Design a protein around this ligand. Structure first.
Ligand SMILES: CCCCCCCCCCCCCCCCCC(=O)OC[C@H](CO[C@@H]1O[C@H](CO[C@H]2O[C@H](CO)[C@H](O)[C@H](O)[C@H]2O)[C@H](O)[C@H](O)[C@H]1O)OC(=O)CCCCCCCCCCCCCCCCC
Ligand code: CLA
Ligand code: CLA
Ligand code: CLA
Ligand code: CLA
Ligand code: CLA
Ligand code: CLA
Ligand SMILES: CC1=C(/C=C/C(C)=C/C=C/C(C)=C/C=C/C=C(C)/C=C/C=C(C)/C=C/C2=C(C)CCCC2(C)C)C(C)(C)CCC1
Ligand SMILES: CC1=C(/C=C/C(C)=C/C=C/C(C)=C\C=C\C=C(C)\C=C\C=C(C)\C=C\C2=C(C)CCCC2(C)C)C(C)(C)CCC1
Ligand SMILES: CC1=C(/C=C/C(C)=C/C=CC(/C)=C/C=C/C=C(C)/C=C/C=C(C)/C=C/C2=C(C)CCCC2(C)C)C(C)(C)CCC1
Ligand SMILES: CC1=C(/C=C/C(C)=C/C=C\C(C)=C\C=C\C=C(C)\C=C\C=C(C)\C=C\C2=C(C)CCCC2(C)C)C(C)(C)CCC1
Ligand SMILES: [Ca+2]
Ligand SMILES: [Cl-]
Ligand SMILES: [Cl-]
Ligand SMILES: [Mg+2]
Lengths: 37, 39, 38, 29, 81, 56, 342, 34, 30, 451, 62, 137, 34, 38
């Protein structure tokens, strides 16, 4: 576990590692916005 | 005698005739309403 | 068997040297179009 | 469990939000 | 093109989404309730987690007679007390 | 295990048999064997063939 | 002539997003019902009463393990019609008896008929030769041999493949252990045709893509093609020299190349269908008699063939009691074939 | 300018309507406990 | 005799490879 | 918008980053933002692992891969690899996560706000791919950087607490390395070892002295090479041997990374020194040997004479000879006789496993260790059901060794594919036919027929 | 110090979210770049400050 | 079939006394068994010594008897060989050897009771599968 | 090995008969006027 | 009514996220309740 003082951030910490994948997905949203020109 | 399975056969026959019948009725109807333009 | 070993080692070294020096011998220039790739 | 889905909801929306905001404002996409 | 309205036209229109922000969630919810109410089990005859075996039974309720199979299944279901 | 035609195999059953589990990942060229008879017993042809094949 | 038949013909053959045709009347309901039946069964329907298996999302199965399973062995080869003497019109009981299996298999079959007829009809209307339908004869030969002929030669529909991912895998392993199906030269021709087809697909795609003429300025080369252009988009001559110098032989005739691309996988599948037809009667390539006579007399004689038979024997003994529950197999620990330790 | 109810519309909905219903069902299924 | 048959067929196939490669009908541009 | 569509760039959206080949500023943005992604993952993954971490369970029962890396450096662990302080893990994770914000900031800036090209802005940061000297200069900078990294490892090992040593006398423990191996005969001797069984090339490194000395060597080599490349331009033979373009250098790096990927795969699969089994779980060989050890112990306790016990095949049930005569565990684990591990070695004599030591000297900690490793063998399903493929659901386990080996084989392979793709494209583009054959100048048409 | 810590850290997270959306949008927006550059400078200095604050207060809460 | 109070009713001691476990106790028992025991005792067998299993009859014939909550809990504190003759805490997980088997460190008396209860209830459900090994999979 | 004693003739005719058919057709093709 | 009012990239992003959510739920369900093995 994280030190007790940080325990409230457990759910955020549970989610963080997946964020990089979102950047790949972001690239497509962006490309969708410019019509994949 | 009409056994339960012969009755079943008749039910199947009717069901198939109904499905195909309604299908052709509907398709003919639609074909008549939405004719292709020629000439 | 030692002689077979030495023979194979020499053969392998030979062909390997042919491969390496061969690709070192201006391979980019060996094409039908643009040769000046140096 | 509710907290985790809330976090991934804000984080998850952030990107498309960036794109949406830029598209609305005719940004340099 | 074959005369039908382009899909991109349809699905980028307000009216489509007015219709479908209703119809799609409604269908999803209907399926959900189809399961959560247990109706699916009853319709299809699928065992609930508590209905595979009688309490002390470890034998599969396998159908072993073609023409009395219906009755066999009913008996197996009855034996679940 | 017999793999060859002359030792009782046909085309479907025949094989070059993998090298001995006793060898493992050890490199077993012909010259590591005390004899060809040993090399053959322990499945040296398998290693020679697959290594030359993969390189080739 | 302008009666109702021709007017119907007019509407049926209208150029719309999804072509219908006369073939559509057979195809679409049968295909829709086959697929819908599969989804319905895999979502909601058990195989508890037929197999002693869970097979639906409802029961906790996932996409890999869900199936619409075959009927109980006791059903024999019953058409298992909803209105038949087994279910007697009761839909729930019908589901519980495995009615969805025959439902799916038969609607599936007529649906495949509809699809191939569709291929013929469209080929005729557009004015092309009907090689797509002819090639489609192979998938049909496979479906018919495996899902219909095979169980028809066996005791019941029970031993047909169940419509499911894992179930199909089970079907594969059953065929190994019981039929030694890998040893069967018709299956071997099937394999050669499938892998050979994939090889031809890959090699042809890559060859075309790597002998393209530069027809644009773009480094991405797809736009530099126009459907209506007269010229070949790639160099047959250069491709031919390349493979001639690489492999020793090469295509020189594009028509031959593509006919060959039809021929290889279709023929492969057809051969496999013939083999499965053999397996319907248990007419297997299980053994080499010379091998067995030698091994019987010589306990030092071992080939990969004999090893594989040991594997088959294990498969049979360990899987049969649960895979074939109608047989009431009880195999005592002591009769189970096992090597040392395992 | 464009018709709404076409053969294509029908085909699409025969697949899409049950699909959403089923996905809702299976989603509900994920919370079932023995 | 089996072995002879198998090896024979194989050898025929290899020879066939040889002829099919070096003695093929040459491809000609018309 | 410059070069951000196909008509102007020549590259479709799906090849969009190729639009960046000659836009050094935006390409710098791409690179820095990406480094941001990597550091971000290191940090967030570390925090996730720590949040999920139960200190009294072995790490390898908990799906941990980064904490094992930190622990191997000697942080947060004591004797036997027991966790004594989770705070170092927290620090590593947090500092990476924070640093990632910085890299991301610079990356986003360069990518969308900063100068698209750097050449007009700066002669030092600007570059031409075809400028061989600038390329070798930048390469030199990065080589010095890497050398500094390796020396950072040496520093950790020698001056800042040491490294976890599974081989430490009296049991695995964090240990300061005071006498690193400098002898070039040993160090490069590793580089000349066979990659086959019983040798295993660099993967065979089995003591921290060799590791640290090796990193001393690599650090100095890398710094010297960096200086070399800042001070020199490529010789004639190199000029004539290579393709000099962005895509070519990319292809070379892809090849190298592929090679490195496969090396890492074998490293995590076989090596238990820089990948301590305390943290990563037992290797396959380790666990098979551990099974043999376990039952040798069990049956010997029951009164079996394990030296004279003949198995069904004629081979020793428990003990047999390797092909060179060494006494080894028998059965299938015969294949793994090259395995070496701290729990087994005390039973090893000059001729291999010593029967008298086996009879008299096996300690309870060895039985425990062998049982633990045997029952934490790196076998398991994709949904992480531990054990053989036929095992029932019960145990939630896949060895970290398996996750890291499989992931890195997949990555190394696709990077080999990328290498072929980009090397071939760089060749074709350099020669000027990457877009296809000139219809009016088809080379083969000017070649004589083959027959 | 737990009040200071837990809110300085919540503020760090919040500001981070704000920067994550705001900075790229600012970088790519045509107008109001003058106001944006200064807001980004401020946000960045404040972010660094909050990181250091959380960092110090850490040892008085753990 | 259901996980009824009767199924969850298992022997507390050798003197005819029973204890009825709650469903939550059964779940805790499965969880803790998986956590601490299943690496070797998956499915009721013993990977490092298959001669000895966790079948109820076998536990009944162990010395002292282990076919009750108390026997199993004591085992988890002070494991012996099957005849009770030697104490094996040094090579087997126990509270007494929590120093060398660190997963036992956070196990409470309640936890031991839950694990014991899992061990006794599971064969009542699974029959020959419990301790049966691969033959019964 | 106790092989089927007809396997030899079966294989031999299996190879020879169609091979001969093909050789006949090829050779009579070549001898036609160019 | 008017085609184009709601941009296609938004429709795609929202629909895609919906798919990710539902599939994600199915994977959660692989570890909980029926089929979880527990
Ligand atoms: C430019 C490139 C030049 C190439 C030209 C060709 C030259 C030949 C190259 C050799 C090919 C590899 C063959 C054997 C690979 C091997 O057995 O790999 C294993 C070895 C390690 O071997 C093992 O290493 C172990 C070392 O551990 C020992 O020491 C440890 C210390 O902790 C422990 O104590 C441990 O218990 C103890 O056993 C043991 O010695 C084992 O016996 C030993 O087998 O890894 C290694 O050497 C390092 C990894 C080698 C690469 C892995 C192969 C992958 C390549 C295929 C890519 C696919 C291509 C796709 C095309 C499309
Ligand atoms: C053209 C599309 C088509 C086709 C080819 C089929 C084909 C099949 N379906 Mg059907 N099915 C369809 C559409 C189709 N289906 C549709 C749209 C539905 C949804 C309502 C269903 C629902 C359905 C169900 C629920 C079931 C089937 C089943 C069957 C099979 C048995 C049918 C039978 O026995 O008919 C017999 C009838 C005929 C062949 C029609 C004969 C018409 C003749 C020429 C006219 C004579 C009739 C006469 C007027 C009647 C006088 C009788 C008098 C003396 C009393 C069969 C494989 C069953 C099955 O699969 O079980 C496993 C089954 O249970 N289908
Ligand atoms: C590692 C991932 C990665 C990276 C670093 C890049 C980098 C870059 N891409 Mg891209 N690209 C990628 C993946 C990536 N790409 C993928 C997967 C694809 C295929 C879908 C593409 C397809 C692609 C194309 C088709 C093109 C690029 C181009 C570009 C560059 C200009 C982008 C632009 O103009 O923004 C415009 C977009 C915006 C202004 C919207 C906001 C974007 C910002 C950067 C998001 C930042 C969010 C982040 C959370 C904020 C944190 C800030 C905080 C630290 C304070 C840029 C250098 C272009 C280029 O070559 O230019 C010449 C170009 O045309 N890329
Ligand atoms: C180096 C790569 C790597 C490795 C070895 C691991 C290893 C591990 N991770 Mg980690 N993880 C990684 C990257 C990696 N992860 C990344 C990048 C992320 C961010 C998304 C995460 C996020 C993550 C989380 C959130 C968690 C883990 C956890 C775990 C463990 C369980 C893994 C699992 O169950 O897989 C499941 C298997 C899959 C999901 C299948 C992956 C298959 C991919 C899609 C195929 C890739 C193919 C190729 C690259 C694509 C090329 C295409 C081609 C056409 C070019 C395991 C120890 C878990 C854990 O137990 O923590 C304690 C945990 O909770 N990981
Ligand atoms: C490889 C990484 C890299 C590179 C090559 C560049 C290159 C460039 N940057 Mg960029 N930058 C980077 C990362 C990088 N930056 C990052 C991460 C950020 C976010 C903090 C920024 C933020 C940034 C801004 C805001 C600006 C630039 C600009 C500049 C240019 C002038 C820089 C200068 O004059 O330095 C002269 C040297 C110094 C000022 C002293 C450097 C002190 C360093 C930090 C000491 C520590 C070095 C240490 C070894 C780093 C290890 C980090 C490692 C752990 C990752 C130049 C083109 C400018 C520009 O493009 O103008 C239009 C500009 O305004 N950069
Ligand atoms: C990433 C780091 C890096 C990179 C990209 C380069 C790249 C470059 N270096 Mg090198 N260099 C480096 C690090 C690096 N160097 C270091 C650290 C040193 C100090 C030791 C040197 C010292 C150096 C010198 C002294 C020279 C170069 C030269 C060159 C250039 C051509 C080299 C080449 O053709 O290699 C191809 C390699 C060969 C032709 C060697 C023989 C190939 C054998 C057969 C391969 C055997 C390896 C095999 C895969 C197995 C590995 C194990 C093995 C040891 C048993 C080139 C620009 C040359 C140059 O032009 O300088 C300006 C040059 O003369 N470099
Ligand atoms: C450092 C590594 C590296 C780098 C810098 C590049 C850089 C470049 N490559 Mg790439 N490439 C690489 C590795 C790398 N490559 C590898 C390993 C492969 C083998 C698969 C390829 C194969 C490749 C091809 C086939 C092509 C390129 C191209 C290009 C250029 C444009 C890339 C583009 O815009 O992609 C845009 C990005 C996308 C469209 C996204 C790709 C999606 C991937 C395959 C799935 C990711 C799976 C993920 C890890 C796990 C699942 C997550 C889930 C959310 C989906 C660009 C110059 C193109 C080119 O030739 O340029 C000249 C080109 O056509 N590359
Ligand atoms: C049989 C029956 C019949 C009919 C019925 C039917 C026909 C129904 C329909 C229905 C159907 C029709 C179903 C629905 C569906 C689908 C679903 C169930 C869902 C899904 C999928 C998915 C989930 C997606 C995902 C994935 C993939 C696949 C793709 C991409 C990727 C991803 C990941 C996304 C009748 C009644 C007459 C009679 C009796 C019986
Ligand atoms: C660390 C820290 C931070 C973090 C930050 C980050 C960095 C995030 C970012 C963000 C991200 C980075 C996200 C991204 C996004 C979006 C999404 C969700 C994605 C997607 C996709 C889609 C859904 C797709 C669809 C479509 C396309 C568009 C086109 C084509 C078709 C398709 C279908 C594919 C914070 C603040 C939290 C605080 C705490 C901690
Ligand atoms: C170029 C671009 C690209 C990419 C993008 C990027 C790659 C960028 C980046 C990078 C990044 C990477 C950024 C970020 C994030 C991070 C942050 C924002 C930081 C913060 C941190 C904090 C806040 C921490 C807190 C903590 C404490 C300290 C303790 C424990 C708990 C917690 C966790 C709370 C794309 C594809 C879109 C396309 C277009 C263009
Ligand atoms: C830390 C470590 C240590 C040490 C390390 C070492 C010292 C190593 C090294 C260094 C080195 C020394 C590395 C390497 C190698 C190099 C490379 C990898 C090469 C390559 C080659 C190539 C690639 C070329 C290409 C081609 C040729 C072949 C021909 C012609 C054309 C061309 C040129 C293109 C040890 C292990 C003891 C232990 C552990 C840790
Ligand atoms: Ca319950
Ligand atoms: Cl063994
Ligand atoms: Cl027993
Ligand atoms: Mg569930």
């Amino acid at each position: 576990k994280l030190p007790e003082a940080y325990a409230i951030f457990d759910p955020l910490v549970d989610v963080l590692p997946v964020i990089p994948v979102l950047f790949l997905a972001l690239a497509f949203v962006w490309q969708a916005a410019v019509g994949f020109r | 005698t009409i056994t339960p399975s012969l009755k079943g056969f008749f039910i199947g026959l009717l069901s198939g005739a109904v499905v195909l019948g309604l299908t052709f009725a509907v398709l003919i109807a639609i074909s008549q309403i939405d004719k292709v333009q020629r000439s | 068997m030692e002689t077979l070993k030495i023979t194979v080692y020499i053969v392998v070294t030979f062909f390997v040297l042919l491969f390496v020096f061969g690709f070192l011998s201006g391979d980019p220039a060996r094409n039908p179009k643009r040769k000046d790739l140096e | 469990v509710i907290a985790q889905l809330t976090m991934i909801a804000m984080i998850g929306i952030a990107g498309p939000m960036i794109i949406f905001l830029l598209a609305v404002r005719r940004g340099n996409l | 093109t074959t005369g039908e309205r382009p899909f991109s036209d349809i699905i980028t229109s307000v009216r489509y989404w007015v219709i479908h922000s209703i119809t799609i969630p409604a269908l999803f919810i209907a399926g959900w309730l189809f399961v959560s109410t247990g109706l699916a089990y009853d319709v299809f005859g699928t065992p609930r987690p508590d209905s595979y075996y009688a309490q002390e039974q470890r034998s599969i309720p396998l159908v072993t007679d073609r023409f009395e199979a219906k009755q066999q299944v009913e008996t197996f279901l009855e034996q679940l007390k | 295990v017999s793999g060859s035609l002359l030792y009782g195999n046909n085309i479907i059953t025949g094989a070059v048999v993998p090298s001995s589990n006793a060898i493992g990942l050890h490199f077993y060229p012909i010259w590591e064997a005390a004899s060809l008879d040993e090399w053959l017993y322990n499945g040296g042809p398998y290693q020679l063939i697959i290594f030359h094949f993969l390189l080739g | 002539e302008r009666g109702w038949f021709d007017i119907l013909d007019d509407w049926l053959k209208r150029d719309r997003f999804v072509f219908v045709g006369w073939s559509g009347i057979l195809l679409f309901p049968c295909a829709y019902l086959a697929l819908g039946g599969w989804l319905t069964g895999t979502t909601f329907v058990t195989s508890w009463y037929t197999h002693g298996l869970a097979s639906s999302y409802l029961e906790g199965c996932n996409f890999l393990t869900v199936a619409v399973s075959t009927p109980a062995n006791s059903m024999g080869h019953s058409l298992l019609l909803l209105w038949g003497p087994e279910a007697q019109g009761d839909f729930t009981r019908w589901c519980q008896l495995g009615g969805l299996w025959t439902f799916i298999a038969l609607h599936g079959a007529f649906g495949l008929i509809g699809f191939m007829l569709r291929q013929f009809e469209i080929a005729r209307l557009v004015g092309v030769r009907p090689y797509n339908a002819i090639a489609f004869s192979a998938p049909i030969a496979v479906f018919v041999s495996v899902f219909l002929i095979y169980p028809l030669g066996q005791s019941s529909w029970f031993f047909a493949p169940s419509f499911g991912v894992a179930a199909i895998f089970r079907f594969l392993l059953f065929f190994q252990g019981f039929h030694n199906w890998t040893l069967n030269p018709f299956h071997m021709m099937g394999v050669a045709g499938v892998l050979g087809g994939a090889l031809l697909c890959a090699i042809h795609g890559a060859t075309v893509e790597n002998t393209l003429f530069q027809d644009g300025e773009g480094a991405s080369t797809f736009r530099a093609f126009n459907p209506t252009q007269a010229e070949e988009t790639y160099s047959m001559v250069t491709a031919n020299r390349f493979w001639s110098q690489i492999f020793g032989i090469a295509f020189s005739n594009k028509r031959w190349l593509h006919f060959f691309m039809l021929f290889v996988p279709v023929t492969g599948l057809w051969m496999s269908a013939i083999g499965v037809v053999g397996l319907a009667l248990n007419l297997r390539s299980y053994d080499f008699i010379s091998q067995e006579i030698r091994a019987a007399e010589d306990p030092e004689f071992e080939t990969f063939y004999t090893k594989n038979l040991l594997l088959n024997e294990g498969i049979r003994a360990w899987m049969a009691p649960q895979d074939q529950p109608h047989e009431n197999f009880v195999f005592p620990e002591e009769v189970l074939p096992r090597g040392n330790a395992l | 300018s464009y018709p709404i109810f076409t053969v294509r519309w029908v085909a699409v909905h025969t697949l899409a309507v049950p699909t959403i219903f089923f996905l809702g069902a299976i989603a509900a299924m994920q919370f079932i406990q023995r | 005799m089996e072995t002879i048959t198998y090896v024979f067929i194989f050898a025929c196939i290899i020879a066939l490879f040889f002829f099919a490669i070096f003695f093929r009908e040459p491809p000609r541009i018309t | 918008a410059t070069n951000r569509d196909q008509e102007s760039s020549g590259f479709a959206w799906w090849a969009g980053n190729a639009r960046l080949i000659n836009l050094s500023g935006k390409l710098l943005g791409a690179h820095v933002a990406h480094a941001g992604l990597i550091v971000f993952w290191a940090g967030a993954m570390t925090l996730f692992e720590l949040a999920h971490f139960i200190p009294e369970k072995p790490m390898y029962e908990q799906g941990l891969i980064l904490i094992p890396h930190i622990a191997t450096l000697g942080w947060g662990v004591g004797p036997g690899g027991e966790v004594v302080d989770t705070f170092p893990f927290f620090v590593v994770g947090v500092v990476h996560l924070i640093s990632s914000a910085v890299l991301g900031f610079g990356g986003v800036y360069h990518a969308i706000r900063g100068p698209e090209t750097l050449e007009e802005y700066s002669s030092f940061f600007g570059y031409d791919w075809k400028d061989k000297n600038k390329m070798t200069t930048i390469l030199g900078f990065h080589l010095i950087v890497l050398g500094i990294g390796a020396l950072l490892l040496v520093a950790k090992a020698m001056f800042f607490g040491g490294l976890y040593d599974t081989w430490a006398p009296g049991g695995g423990d964090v240990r300061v390395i005071t006498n690193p191996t400098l002898d070039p005969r040993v160090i490069f001797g590793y580089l000349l070892k066979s990659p086959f069984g019983g040798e295993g090339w660099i993967v065979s490194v089995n003591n921290l002295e060799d590791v640290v000395g090796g990193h001393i060597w690599i650090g100095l080599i890398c710094i010297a090479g960096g200086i070399w490349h800042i001070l020199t331009t490529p010789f004639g033979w190199a000029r004539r041997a290579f393709i000099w373009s962005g895509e070519a250098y990319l292809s070379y790096s892809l090849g190298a990374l592929s090679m490195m990927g496969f090396i890492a795969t074998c490293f995590v699969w076989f090596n238990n020194t820089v990948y301590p089994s305390e943290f990563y779980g037992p290797t396959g060989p380790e666990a098979s040997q551990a099974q043999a050890m376990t039952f040798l112990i069990r049956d010997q306790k029951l009164g079996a004479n394990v030296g004279s016990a003949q198995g069904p095949t004629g081979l020793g049930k428990y003990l047999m000879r390797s092909p060179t005569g060494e006494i080894i565990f028998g059965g299938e684990t015969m294949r793994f006789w090259d395995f070496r591990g701290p729990w087994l070695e005390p039973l090893r004599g000059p001729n291999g496993l010593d029967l008298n030591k086996i009879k008299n000297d096996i300690q309870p900690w060895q039985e425990r260790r062998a049982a633990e490793y045997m029952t934490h063998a790196p076998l398991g399903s994709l949904n992480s059901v531990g054990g053989v493929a036929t095992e029932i659901n019960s145990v939630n386990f896949v060895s970290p060794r398996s996750w890291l080996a499989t992931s890195h084989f997949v990555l190394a392979f696709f990077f080999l594919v990328g290498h072929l793709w980009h090397a071939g494209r760089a060749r074709a583009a350099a020669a000027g036919f990457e877009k296809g054959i000139d219809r009016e100048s088809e080379p083969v048409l000017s070649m004589p027929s083959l027959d | 110090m737990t009040i200071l810590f837990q809110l300085a850290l919540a503020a760090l997270v919040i500001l981070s979210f704000v920067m994550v959306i705001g900075v790229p949008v600012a970088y790519a927006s045509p107008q109001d770049w003058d106001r944006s550059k200064q807001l980004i400078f401020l946000g960045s200095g404040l972010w660094i400050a909050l990181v250091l604050v959380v960092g110090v207060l850490n040892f008085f809460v753990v | 079939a259901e996980l009824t109070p009767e199924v969850l009713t298992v022997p507390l001691n050798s003197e005819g006394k029973t204890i009825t476990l709650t469903e939550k106790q059964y779940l805790e028992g499965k969880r803790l068994f998986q956590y601490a025991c299943a690496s070797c005792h998956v499915g009721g067998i013993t990977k490092t010594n298959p001669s000895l299993d966790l079948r109820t009859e076998t536990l009944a014939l162990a010395t002292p008897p282990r076919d009750n909550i108390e026997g199993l809990v004591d085992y988890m504190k002070n494991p012996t060989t099957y005849d009770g003759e030697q104490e094996i805490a040094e090579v087997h997980p126990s509270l007494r050897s929590a120093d060398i088997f660190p997963k036992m460190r956070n196990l409470t008396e309640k936890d031991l009771v839950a694990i014991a209860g899992h061990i006794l209830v599971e064969p009542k459900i699974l029959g020959d599968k419990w301790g049966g090994g691969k033959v019964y999979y | 090995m106790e092989v089927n004693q007809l396997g030899l003739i079966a294989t031999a005719l299996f190879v020879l008969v169609p091979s001969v058919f093909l050789i006949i057709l090829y050779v009579q093709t070549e001898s036609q006027q160019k | 009514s008017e085609g184009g009012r709601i941009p296609l990239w938004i429709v795609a992003t929202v629909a895609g996220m919906g798919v990710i959510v539902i599939v994600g739920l199915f994977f959660y369900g692989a570890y909980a309740g029926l089929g979880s093995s527990l």
